[PDB]
Amino acid sequence: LVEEALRKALEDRYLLAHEAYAGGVAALVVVHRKEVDQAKAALSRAGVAE
Amino acid sequence: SKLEAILSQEVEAEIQALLQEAEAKAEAVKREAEEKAKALLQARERALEAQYRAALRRAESA
Amino acid sequence: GLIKSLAEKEKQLLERLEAAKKEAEERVKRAEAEAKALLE
Question: Does A36 contact chain C (CB < 8 Å)?
């Protein structure tokens, strides 16, 4: 859900990474400082948040 | 990748604005000087020339 | 995770932008020299 949201908003100009460690998987979205607004907006839809 | 392409182009158009911006502000300074001096060399030409004709006048009258 | 790579790209670019600005303002310090000289 986060990936699909990210893809539509950002295009593919972001780095989406995840690894498990117990307690879910820690995930990161990386964007340029210019893409920030869009990147966060993608997250708002997904329902996961900072 | 595509991430770095956009970052390059973003930075590069800013480069194009810094360089021209400094240059024109340098040229305008350069060109200010040319005017500044010209009006001065004229101004001291004027004053001395009249004070020349008029000076000789006072002599002529003497 | 590429990550490291693109977070280097933002450094290189910044120091290229930086470098443009510096030599740019040098040109201004250059026009300052002539501006005194041409009057002197």
Answer: no
Query: Is residue B2 a contact partner of residue A11, using CB atoms and an 8 Å limit?
Result: yes
CATH of the domain at B50: 1.20.5.620
**Parallel, antiparallel or unpaired: strands A15-20 and A25-30:** antiparallel
What method did the depositors use to determine the structure? cryo-EM
Strand locations in chain A (E) = 15-20, 25-30
Number of domains making up chain B: 1
**Contact check, Cβ <8 Å, C6/A17:** no
Phi, psi of C18 (to 5 degrees): -50, -55
Q: Which domain holds residue B39?
A: 1-62
Query: Quick one: resolution in A?
Result: 5.0
